[PDB]
Coordinates of C-alpha atoms and ligand atoms in Angstrom, one line a residue:
Chain Z
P21 CA 125.6 41.1 229.4
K22 CA 129.1 39.1 227.8
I23 CA 131.5 39.2 230.3
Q24 CA 131.1 35.5 232.8
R25 CA 131.2 35.5 236.4
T26 CA 133.7 32.1 238.1
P27 CA 131.5 30.7 240.9
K28 CA 132.6 31.4 245.0
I29 CA 133.3 27.8 247.1
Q30 CA 132.3 27.6 250.6
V31 CA 132.0 24.6 252.7
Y32 CA 131.2 24.9 256.1
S33 CA 129.8 22.1 258.4
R34 CA 126.5 23.5 260.7
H35 CA 127.9 22.6 263.5
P36 CA 131.6 22.6 264.5
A37 CA 133.1 18.7 263.5
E38 CA 133.9 16.3 265.9
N39 CA 134.6 13.8 265.1
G40 CA 132.5 10.1 265.4
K41 CA 128.9 13.5 266.0
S42 CA 127.0 13.2 263.4
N43 CA 126.2 17.2 261.3
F44 CA 125.9 18.9 257.7
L45 CA 128.1 20.1 255.6
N46 CA 127.2 22.8 253.0
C47 CA 128.6 24.4 250.1
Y48 CA 128.1 27.8 249.2
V49 CA 128.5 28.4 244.9
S50 CA 127.7 31.9 244.3
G51 CA 128.7 35.0 243.0
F52 CA 128.5 32.5 239.1
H53 CA 127.3 33.9 235.9
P54 CA 125.7 31.9 233.8
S55 CA 123.3 30.0 235.8
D56 CA 123.9 27.3 234.3
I57 CA 125.9 24.5 236.9
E58 CA 126.8 21.9 238.3
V59 CA 127.9 21.5 241.7
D60 CA 129.3 17.3 243.9
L61 CA 129.5 16.6 247.5
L62 CA 132.5 14.8 247.7
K63 CA 133.0 12.2 251.1
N64 CA 137.2 10.6 249.9
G65 CA 136.6 11.9 246.8
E66 CA 134.0 9.7 245.5
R67 CA 129.9 11.9 244.5
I68 CA 127.7 11.8 247.7
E69 CA 124.6 10.1 246.6
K70 CA 121.7 11.7 249.3
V71 CA 122.2 15.6 248.6
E72 CA 120.2 18.4 248.5
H73 CA 119.9 21.1 246.7
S74 CA 118.2 24.8 247.0
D75 CA 116.4 25.7 243.6
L76 CA 118.3 28.7 242.1
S77 CA 118.2 32.1 243.7
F78 CA 120.3 35.1 242.7
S79 CA 122.1 38.9 245.0
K80 CA 121.5 42.2 244.2
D81 CA 124.5 42.1 241.3
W82 CA 122.6 39.7 239.2
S83 CA 125.3 37.2 240.6
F84 CA 124.5 33.2 240.8
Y85 CA 123.7 31.3 244.0
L86 CA 123.5 27.4 244.9
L87 CA 123.2 26.6 248.7
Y88 CA 124.5 22.3 248.8
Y89 CA 124.1 19.9 251.7
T90 CA 124.3 17.1 253.5
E91 CA 124.6 15.2 256.4
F92 CA 128.0 13.6 257.4
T93 CA 129.4 12.4 260.6
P94 CA 133.5 14.0 260.1
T95 CA 136.2 11.6 261.1
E96 CA 139.7 11.6 261.5
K97 CA 140.9 10.2 258.3
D98 CA 138.1 10.8 256.0
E99 CA 138.1 14.1 253.7
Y100 CA 135.3 15.5 252.0
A101 CA 134.9 18.3 248.9
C102 CA 132.7 21.0 247.0
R103 CA 132.8 19.6 242.9
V104 CA 131.9 22.7 240.6
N105 CA 131.5 23.2 237.0
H106 CA 130.8 26.0 235.1
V107 CA 131.8 27.1 231.8
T108 CA 134.1 30.1 233.4
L109 CA 136.0 26.7 234.4
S110 CA 138.3 24.2 231.9
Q111 CA 138.5 21.0 234.4
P112 CA 135.6 21.2 237.7
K113 CA 137.3 22.4 240.3
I114 CA 137.3 21.0 243.8
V115 CA 137.4 22.5 247.6
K116 CA 138.2 20.2 250.5
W117 CA 136.8 20.8 253.6
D118 CA 138.7 22.0 256.0
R119 CA 137.4 22.2 259.9
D120 CA 140.3 24.6 261.1
Chain O
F16 CA 108.6 43.4 264.5
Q17 CA 111.5 41.5 263.8
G18 CA 112.1 38.9 260.2
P19 CA 111.6 39.8 256.8
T20 CA 110.5 42.7 255.4
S21 CA 110.1 42.1 252.5
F22 CA 108.3 40.0 249.0
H23 CA 109.4 39.2 246.2
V24 CA 108.7 37.0 242.7
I25 CA 112.6 35.3 241.1
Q26 CA 112.5 35.2 236.9
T27 CA 115.3 33.3 235.1
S28 CA 114.7 32.5 231.6
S29 CA 118.2 30.8 230.1
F30 CA 117.7 31.1 225.3
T31 CA 120.2 28.3 224.5
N32 CA 119.3 29.2 220.4
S33 CA 115.8 30.6 218.6
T34 CA 113.4 27.3 219.7
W35 CA 114.0 26.2 223.1
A36 CA 114.4 28.7 225.9
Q37 CA 113.4 27.8 229.7
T38 CA 112.9 30.1 232.6
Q39 CA 112.7 29.2 236.1
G40 CA 111.5 30.8 239.3
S41 CA 110.7 31.2 243.0
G42 CA 109.3 33.5 245.5
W43 CA 111.0 34.8 248.8
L44 CA 110.4 36.4 251.6
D45 CA 113.9 38.5 251.8
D46 CA 116.4 35.3 251.8
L47 CA 114.5 32.6 252.5
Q48 CA 111.9 30.3 249.8
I49 CA 108.3 30.1 250.5
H50 CA 107.6 29.7 246.7
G51 CA 108.5 27.2 244.3
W52 CA 108.2 27.9 240.8
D53 CA 107.5 23.7 239.3
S54 CA 107.7 24.1 234.8
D55 CA 106.9 20.5 235.0
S56 CA 102.5 21.9 235.8
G57 CA 103.0 24.7 235.1
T58 CA 101.9 26.3 238.7
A59 CA 103.2 27.2 241.8
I60 CA 104.7 25.0 244.8
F61 CA 103.9 26.3 248.4
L62 CA 107.0 25.0 250.7
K63 CA 105.5 26.5 253.9
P64 CA 102.6 25.7 254.7
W65 CA 101.6 29.6 254.7
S66 CA 102.7 30.2 252.2
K67 CA 99.3 31.4 250.6
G68 CA 98.8 34.2 253.6
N69 CA 95.3 35.3 253.4
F70 CA 94.5 35.0 249.9
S71 CA 91.9 32.6 249.1
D72 CA 92.2 29.5 246.6
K73 CA 90.8 31.4 243.5
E74 CA 92.9 34.0 244.2
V75 CA 96.5 32.0 243.8
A76 CA 95.3 29.9 240.9
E77 CA 94.9 33.7 239.4
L78 CA 98.4 34.3 240.3
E79 CA 99.8 30.9 238.9
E80 CA 97.9 31.7 236.2
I81 CA 99.0 35.1 235.0
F82 CA 102.0 33.8 235.9
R83 CA 102.2 30.6 233.2
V84 CA 100.7 32.7 231.0
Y85 CA 103.2 35.3 232.3
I86 CA 106.3 33.1 231.4
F87 CA 105.1 30.8 228.8
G88 CA 103.9 35.1 226.6
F89 CA 107.0 36.0 227.5
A90 CA 110.2 33.5 226.3
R91 CA 108.0 33.3 222.8
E92 CA 108.2 36.9 222.9
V93 CA 111.5 37.8 223.7
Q94 CA 112.4 34.7 220.2
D95 CA 110.2 37.1 217.5
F96 CA 112.2 39.4 218.6
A97 CA 115.7 38.5 219.2
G98 CA 116.5 39.4 215.5
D99 CA 114.8 42.7 215.7
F100 CA 116.6 43.8 218.9
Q101 CA 120.2 42.1 218.5
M102 CA 120.3 39.5 220.3
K103 CA 123.4 36.8 220.5
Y104 CA 122.5 33.0 221.5
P105 CA 122.6 32.5 224.3
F106 CA 121.5 35.0 227.0
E107 CA 120.0 34.5 230.3
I108 CA 117.5 37.1 231.4
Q109 CA 116.1 37.8 235.6
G110 CA 114.1 39.6 237.2
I111 CA 112.5 40.1 240.3
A112 CA 109.4 42.0 241.3
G113 CA 108.1 42.6 244.8
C114 CA 107.1 45.0 247.4
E115 CA 109.3 45.7 251.4
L116 CA 107.3 47.3 253.8
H117 CA 109.4 49.9 255.9
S118 CA 109.7 51.5 258.6
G119 CA 106.7 53.4 260.0
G120 CA 104.7 51.0 257.7
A121 CA 105.4 52.1 254.3
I122 CA 105.4 50.2 250.9
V123 CA 107.6 50.4 248.5
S124 CA 107.3 48.1 245.6
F125 CA 110.2 47.2 242.8
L126 CA 110.8 45.4 239.2
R127 CA 114.2 45.2 237.7
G128 CA 115.2 43.6 234.8
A129 CA 118.9 42.0 233.9
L130 CA 120.4 41.1 230.7
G131 CA 123.3 39.4 230.3
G132 CA 123.7 39.5 234.4
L133 CA 123.5 42.6 233.8
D134 CA 120.8 46.3 234.7
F135 CA 118.1 46.5 232.1
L136 CA 115.7 48.3 232.6
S137 CA 112.8 49.0 235.8
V138 CA 109.6 50.1 236.2
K139 CA 109.2 53.1 238.0
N140 CA 105.8 55.2 238.6
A141 CA 104.0 51.9 236.9
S142 CA 106.6 53.3 233.6
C143 CA 109.2 51.0 232.3
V144 CA 112.5 53.0 233.0
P145 CA 114.6 52.2 230.4
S146 CA 118.5 50.9 232.8
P147 CA 122.2 52.8 231.3
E148 CA 123.6 49.8 231.5
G149 CA 120.4 48.5 229.2
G150 CA 121.6 51.1 226.6
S151 CA 120.5 51.7 223.4
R152 CA 118.9 48.1 223.4
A153 CA 116.0 48.7 227.0
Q154 CA 115.3 51.4 225.6
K155 CA 112.9 49.2 221.9
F156 CA 112.3 47.1 224.7
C157 CA 109.9 50.1 227.0
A158 CA 108.9 51.2 223.5
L159 CA 108.5 47.9 222.4
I160 CA 106.9 47.2 225.7
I161 CA 103.5 49.7 226.0
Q162 CA 102.4 48.7 222.7
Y163 CA 101.1 45.6 224.8
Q164 CA 97.5 46.2 225.8
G165 CA 97.2 45.3 228.9
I166 CA 101.0 44.6 231.0
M167 CA 101.4 47.7 232.2
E168 CA 98.3 48.4 234.3
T169 CA 98.6 44.6 235.2
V170 CA 102.2 45.4 236.4
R171 CA 100.3 48.0 238.7
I172 CA 98.5 46.4 239.7
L173 CA 100.3 44.2 241.4
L174 CA 102.5 45.7 242.2
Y175 CA 101.3 48.6 244.1
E176 CA 98.2 47.3 245.1
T177 CA 97.9 43.0 244.8
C178 CA 102.4 42.6 246.4
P179 CA 101.0 45.0 249.5
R180 CA 97.6 43.4 250.9
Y181 CA 99.6 39.6 250.1
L182 CA 103.3 40.7 252.4
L183 CA 100.6 42.1 254.9
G184 CA 98.9 38.6 254.8
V185 CA 101.7 36.5 254.6
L186 CA 104.0 37.8 257.4
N187 CA 100.7 37.3 259.6
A188 CA 100.5 34.3 258.6
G189 CA 103.7 32.7 258.0
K190 CA 104.1 34.7 262.6
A191 CA 105.3 31.3 264.0
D192 CA 107.9 30.6 261.8
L193 CA 109.3 34.6 260.9
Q194 CA 109.3 36.1 264.2
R195 CA 111.4 32.2 265.8
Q196 CA 114.3 33.5 267.4
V197 CA 116.5 30.2 267.4
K198 CA 120.1 30.7 269.2
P199 CA 123.9 30.7 267.5
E200 CA 126.3 28.3 268.8
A201 CA 129.4 29.5 268.6
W202 CA 132.9 28.6 268.6
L203 CA 137.0 29.7 267.9
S204 CA 139.4 28.2 265.9
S205 CA 143.4 29.8 265.0
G206 CA 145.4 29.2 261.7
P207 CA 148.2 31.6 260.7
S208 CA 149.4 34.9 258.7
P209 CA 151.5 35.5 256.7
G210 CA 152.9 38.6 259.3
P211 CA 156.0 37.0 260.8
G212 CA 155.0 36.6 264.0
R213 CA 151.0 36.8 263.8
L214 CA 148.5 34.6 264.1
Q215 CA 144.2 35.2 263.1
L216 CA 141.8 34.4 265.5
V217 CA 138.4 33.0 264.2
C218 CA 135.5 33.1 266.7
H219 CA 131.8 30.8 264.1
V220 CA 128.7 31.8 265.0
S221 CA 125.7 29.8 263.8
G222 CA 121.9 28.2 263.9
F223 CA 120.8 32.0 264.6
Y224 CA 117.6 32.4 263.1
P225 CA 116.7 36.5 263.0
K226 CA 120.0 36.8 260.5
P227 CA 120.4 40.4 262.4
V228 CA 123.9 39.4 265.0
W229 CA 126.8 41.5 266.6
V230 CA 129.7 39.1 266.3
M231 CA 133.5 40.8 268.3
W232 CA 136.1 40.5 268.8
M233 CA 136.9 42.4 272.5
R234 CA 139.8 43.1 275.0
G235 CA 137.7 42.7 278.5
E236 CA 135.5 46.0 277.4
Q237 CA 137.0 47.1 274.7
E238 CA 136.0 46.3 270.6
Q239 CA 138.7 45.3 268.2
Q240 CA 138.2 47.3 265.1
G241 CA 140.3 44.8 263.4
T242 CA 137.4 42.7 263.5
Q243 CA 137.1 40.7 260.5
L244 CA 133.1 39.9 259.5
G245 CA 132.8 37.3 256.7
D246 CA 130.0 37.1 254.2
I247 CA 126.6 36.0 256.4
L248 CA 125.9 32.1 254.5
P249 CA 123.2 29.5 254.7
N250 CA 122.2 26.5 256.6
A251 CA 119.8 24.8 254.8
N252 CA 116.2 25.6 257.4
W253 CA 116.3 28.9 258.0
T254 CA 119.8 30.1 260.0
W255 CA 122.9 31.5 259.1
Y256 CA 126.8 31.5 259.7
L257 CA 129.0 33.9 260.0
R258 CA 133.0 33.9 261.1
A259 CA 135.2 37.1 263.1
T260 CA 138.3 36.7 262.1
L261 CA 141.3 39.3 264.1
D262 CA 144.6 39.0 262.9
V263 CA 147.4 39.4 266.3
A264 CA 150.9 39.4 266.6
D265 CA 151.5 36.0 268.4
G266 CA 153.0 37.4 272.2
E267 CA 149.0 39.3 272.3
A268 CA 146.6 37.0 271.9
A269 CA 146.2 36.6 275.2
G270 CA 143.7 38.7 276.5
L271 CA 141.6 38.5 273.8
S272 CA 137.4 37.0 273.5
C273 CA 135.1 36.7 271.2
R274 CA 132.0 38.3 272.0
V275 CA 128.3 37.9 270.0
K276 CA 125.1 39.5 270.7
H277 CA 121.6 38.3 268.6
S278 CA 118.2 39.2 269.1
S279 CA 118.7 35.2 270.5
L280 CA 120.2 35.1 273.8
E281 CA 117.8 37.3 275.8
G282 CA 120.5 39.2 277.3
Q283 CA 123.0 36.3 277.5
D284 CA 126.1 37.7 275.2
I285 CA 128.2 34.4 274.1
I286 CA 131.4 35.2 275.5
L287 CA 134.4 32.5 274.7
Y288 CA 138.1 32.7 275.9
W289 CA 141.0 32.8 273.3
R290 CA 143.5 31.2 276.1
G291 CA 147.2 29.8 274.9
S292 CA 149.8 27.8 274.5
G293 CA 147.2 26.1 272.8
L294 CA 144.7 25.6 275.8
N295 CA 141.7 25.7 272.9
Ligands
LIG308 C1 94.8 40.1 253.4 O1 95.0 41.7 254.6 C2 95.8 42.6 254.8 C3 96.1 43.1 254.8 O2 95.3 43.3 256.1 C4 96.0 43.5 257.7 O3 96.2 43.1 258.3 C5 96.2 41.6 258.7 C6 98.2 41.2 259.1 C7 95.8 41.7 259.7 O4 95.6 42.0 260.6 C8 93.8 42.2 258.9 O5 92.5 41.7 259.8 C9 94.3 43.6 258.5 O6 92.8 43.8 257.7 C10 94.1 43.4 253.9 O7 94.4 45.0 253.4 C11 93.5 45.8 253.9 O8 92.2 45.1 254.1 C12 91.4 46.5 254.6 C13 90.3 47.0 254.9 O9 89.7 45.1 255.4 C14 91.9 47.6 254.4 O10 91.8 49.3 255.2 C15 91.1 49.8 253.9 O11 91.8 51.2 254.4 C16 91.2 52.1 253.3 C17 92.1 53.2 253.2 O12 92.9 52.5 252.3 C18 93.3 53.8 252.1 O13 94.4 54.3 252.7 C19 95.2 53.8 253.2 C20 95.9 54.8 254.3 O14 95.7 55.0 255.0 C21 96.2 53.0 252.9 O15 97.8 52.2 253.4 C22 96.3 52.4 251.5 O16 96.8 51.3 250.1 C23 94.8 53.3 250.8 O17 95.6 54.2 249.9 C24 90.3 52.3 254.4 O18 88.8 53.4 253.3 C25 88.9 51.2 254.5 O19 87.7 52.4 256.1 C26 86.7 51.3 254.8 O20 86.3 50.5 255.8 C27 87.1 50.1 257.6 C28 86.8 48.9 257.9 O21 87.8 48.0 257.7 C29 85.4 50.7 257.7 O22 86.1 51.2 259.7 C30 85.6 52.2 257.5 O23 85.0 53.1 258.1 C31 85.6 52.6 255.9 O24 83.5 52.5 255.9 C32 89.7 50.1 255.3 O25 90.9 50.7 256.7 C33 94.0 48.3 254.3 O26 94.0 49.5 253.6 C34 94.4 46.9 253.7 N1 95.8 47.2 253.8 C35 96.7 46.9 252.0 C36 98.2 47.3 252.7 O27 95.9 46.7 251.3 C37 93.5 42.1 252.7 O28 92.1 42.6 252.5 C38 91.6 42.9 250.8 O29 92.4 43.6 250.6 C39 92.1 45.1 250.9 C40 93.2 45.8 250.2 C41 90.3 45.4 250.4 O30 90.0 45.1 249.7 C42 89.4 43.9 252.1 O31 87.9 44.4 251.4 C43 90.2 43.3 250.8 O32 89.3 41.9 252.3 C44 93.4 40.9 253.1 N2 92.9 39.9 252.0 C45 93.2 40.3 250.7 C46 92.8 38.7 250.3 O33 94.6 40.5 250.6
3IY309 C1 108.1 35.7 237.3 C2 107.3 34.7 238.9 C3 107.4 33.5 237.9 C4 107.5 33.0 239.8 C5 106.5 32.8 240.8 C6 107.2 32.0 242.0 C7 105.8 32.1 242.2 C8 104.9 32.8 242.7 C9 103.0 32.3 243.3 C10 102.9 32.9 243.2 C11 100.6 32.8 244.5 C12 101.8 34.1 245.2 C13 101.6 35.1 245.7 C14 101.6 36.3 245.4 C15 102.4 37.8 244.0 C16 101.3 39.0 244.7 C17 101.8 40.2 244.5 C18 102.8 39.6 242.6 C19 104.5 40.8 243.6 C20 105.0 41.4 242.2 C21 104.6 40.9 240.7 C22 104.7 42.3 239.5 C23 104.9 42.1 238.6 C24 104.7 41.0 238.2 C25 105.9 39.9 236.0 C26 104.2 39.1 235.9 C27 104.1 40.8 234.6 C28 103.1 40.4 233.6 C29 102.1 41.1 233.4 C30 100.8 40.7 232.9 O1 99.6 41.4 232.2 O2 102.2 39.7 231.4 C31 100.7 38.2 230.9 C32 100.7 38.0 230.1 O3 101.8 37.5 229.5 C33 102.5 37.4 228.4 O4 102.2 37.7 227.6 C34 103.4 38.7 228.8 C35 103.8 38.9 227.3 C36 105.5 40.1 228.0 C37 106.8 40.2 227.7 C38 107.8 41.2 228.7 C39 106.2 41.7 229.9 C40 107.4 42.2 230.8 C41 107.2 42.3 231.4 C42 108.2 44.1 231.7 C43 107.3 45.3 232.3 C44 108.0 46.3 232.2 C45 99.8 38.3 232.9 O5 98.9 37.8 231.1 P1 96.8 37.7 231.9 O6 97.2 39.4 230.3 O7 97.3 39.3 233.7 O8 96.2 36.7 232.6 C46 95.9 35.8 231.9 C47 94.9 36.1 230.5 N1 94.3 34.7 231.0 C48 93.2 35.7 231.9 C49 93.5 34.2 229.6 C50 94.6 33.2 230.9
LIG310 C1 118.2 25.0 219.7 O1 118.3 24.0 220.8 C2 117.3 23.0 221.8 C3 117.6 22.2 222.3 O2 119.6 21.1 221.7 C4 119.7 20.9 223.4 O3 119.7 22.0 224.7 C5 121.0 22.8 224.5 C6 120.3 23.2 225.7 C7 122.2 21.6 224.3 O4 122.2 21.4 225.8 C8 122.2 20.8 223.4 O5 123.5 20.7 223.4 C9 121.2 19.8 223.5 O6 121.0 19.5 221.5 C10 117.5 21.8 220.0 O7 116.8 20.9 220.1 C11 117.8 20.0 220.1 O8 118.0 19.0 218.8 C12 118.3 17.5 219.6 C13 119.0 17.8 217.7 O9 120.2 18.8 217.3 C14 117.5 16.7 219.2 O10 118.8 14.9 219.9 C15 118.0 14.7 219.8 O11 117.9 14.3 220.9 C16 116.1 12.6 220.2 C17 115.6 11.9 221.6 O12 115.0 13.0 222.2 C18 117.6 11.6 220.1 O13 117.3 10.3 219.6 C19 118.5 11.5 218.7 O14 119.4 11.2 219.2 C20 119.1 12.5 219.5 O15 119.9 13.2 220.2 C21 117.1 17.2 221.1 O16 116.1 16.5 221.5 C22 116.9 18.9 220.8 N1 115.7 18.9 222.7 C23 114.3 19.3 222.3 C24 113.6 19.2 221.0 O17 114.4 19.8 223.4 C25 116.9 22.9 218.7 O18 117.1 21.8 217.4 C26 115.8 21.0 216.4 O19 114.9 21.0 217.2 C27 115.4 19.9 216.9 C28 114.0 19.0 217.1 C29 115.4 18.8 215.6 O20 114.3 19.4 214.9 C30 116.4 20.0 215.0 O21 116.6 19.9 214.2 C31 116.5 21.1 215.7 O22 117.6 22.1 214.7 C32 118.3 24.2 219.0 N2 117.8 25.0 217.7 C33 117.9 25.9 216.4 C34 117.3 26.5 215.3 O23 119.8 25.7 216.5
3IV311 C1 109.8 38.6 237.8 C2 109.3 39.9 236.7 C3 110.3 40.7 237.1 C4 110.8 41.4 235.5 C5 110.8 41.2 234.4 C6 111.5 41.4 233.5 C7 112.4 40.7 232.4 C8 113.2 42.0 231.7 C9 114.5 41.3 230.3 C10 113.9 42.8 229.1 C11 114.2 41.6 227.7 C12 115.6 41.6 227.6 C13 115.9 41.8 226.3 C14 114.4 42.0 225.2 C15 114.4 41.2 224.1 C16 113.2 41.2 223.1 O1 112.6 41.5 223.5 O2 113.1 41.1 221.9
NA312 NA1 119.5 29.1 246.0

């Protein structure tokens, strides 16, 4: 009941990215402890407003995990990311979506 | 039969200080959520139309009451004994309890508790069992909880009598969703690898239900044993995403393919072929 666990952040699209075609952007945040956490999805560095997330759950090793997601249409130049803050993080950690 | 085989409830109780604690909870079939717990009301949220299984509204309400009373009493009791148990705030307690249907039809029940993200106790043969990670604090806790009238008998009934009939009733009630077959989509990509003259090929598989899946890099009929599977990750609305990767020398990537087998494909495996010189 002493050591904290930093969250693992994985960012992936539901379908293979095709510019101009509607898609879903997922952020799976896992492996962390304690459960207190803040997660945003970003478009071009700005907080996406319409984002859904799962109720809290945890894995067999008691580590918490959450799924955040939003509809998005990928384009050539737009950048998307998952921003996470947790007690183990000095500042929010930003993980960019990389289709390849 | 396919789809989930277990039901369980989970609890996360976060103790900020001597006066403030909050609890989150939910109910699950494997990793598919079917109940939420609404702390606004002290009642359950039924996430699917079949989420009550074959239980009557009265029995469902009785169980909501048990959980409501438990959630409230648990925090109070833990705060009352945090002094005697040498607890330092903040701390977080987790619990999981439920039952699972095995091959051959037996249903096995379980209850596990954690403190600080480490195992603390379990229930076995309807007794409180301290886990070694819980130390003497866990032993004190089990010795305490048996002194509370009715708790262990209620836990025994819930685990060994109520949960098995609920599991069977809800697996049947939800079968249209729980045993549905959803075909995955698959695509290939590639990327660098730190090896001289080596690259990493990636086979992506997404949107498949149920969760069991088989993905392998192939050369003709030869399964490439160097295939590495990633984490199986969730999509929203009960499907998953999995990548299979293969580290290969530059001039040896030609001839590779990715083969996907899944219960939904009714024998027609997906085969993707890796083509060279940026031919997608
Ligand atoms: C919700 O569903 C549960 C599962 O129902 C079955 O599966 C679903 C998917 C549907 O297909 C249903 O149509 C189907 O019933 C219900 O639980 C089950 O209830 C039945 C009774 O209806 C019960 O069968 C009895 O079993 C005992 C033997 O049980 C012991 O031994 C077995 C191994 O052999 C062991 O597994 C058990 O744990 C026990 O140790 C048997 O003696 C009974 O025989 C008597 O009755 C039958 C007629 O039913 C008669 O032919 C005989 O001659 C004799 O008189 C009978 O076969 C199942 O064991 C039970 N399953 C489980 C896992 O508990 C559930 O029903 C409710 O709970 C039951 C425990 C029982 O109290 C019922 O009366 C209740 O209505 C149902 N509803 C709720 C609210 O949970
Ligand atoms: C966690 C749940 C969260 C969310 C659930 C989410 C969704 C649920 C949806 C419900 C609908 C679906 C139904 C499916 C459920 C079927 C099976 C459940 C499976 C497993 C459950 C097994 C154990 C659960 C663990 C809970 C143990 C509680 C036992 C107990 O009895 O406790 C309180 C009394 O609260 C106390 O004071 C407790 C204080 C002591 C604390 C220590 C206890 C630690 C237990 C560890 C065991 C070693 C009960 O109250 P009752 O008297 O029974 O009735 C109240 C008195 N009435 C009548 C006057 C009001
Ligand atoms: C134990 O923690 C409680 C919760 O504190 C809050 O939550 C935690 C998770 C953390 O984020 C903290 O940073 C938060 O403060 C304490 O209760 C809170 O106490 C503060 C004051 O210290 C109070 O803030 C006020 O809120 C009112 C409007 O509600 C506002 O007008 C004020 O300007 C001020 O912001 C919170 O409302 C209160 N939260 C509750 C009660 O849920 C608690 O403090 C104890 O309770 C309060 C009511 C006061 O009597 C305090 O003097 C008292 O100590 C903490 N208890 C201890 C023993 O540390
Ligand atoms: C959904 C039901 C799962 C059952 C959960 C049990 C929780 C075990 C943690 C036991 C408490 C750990 C510290 C004790 C503090 C105290 O009492 O002083
Ligand atoms: Na979750």
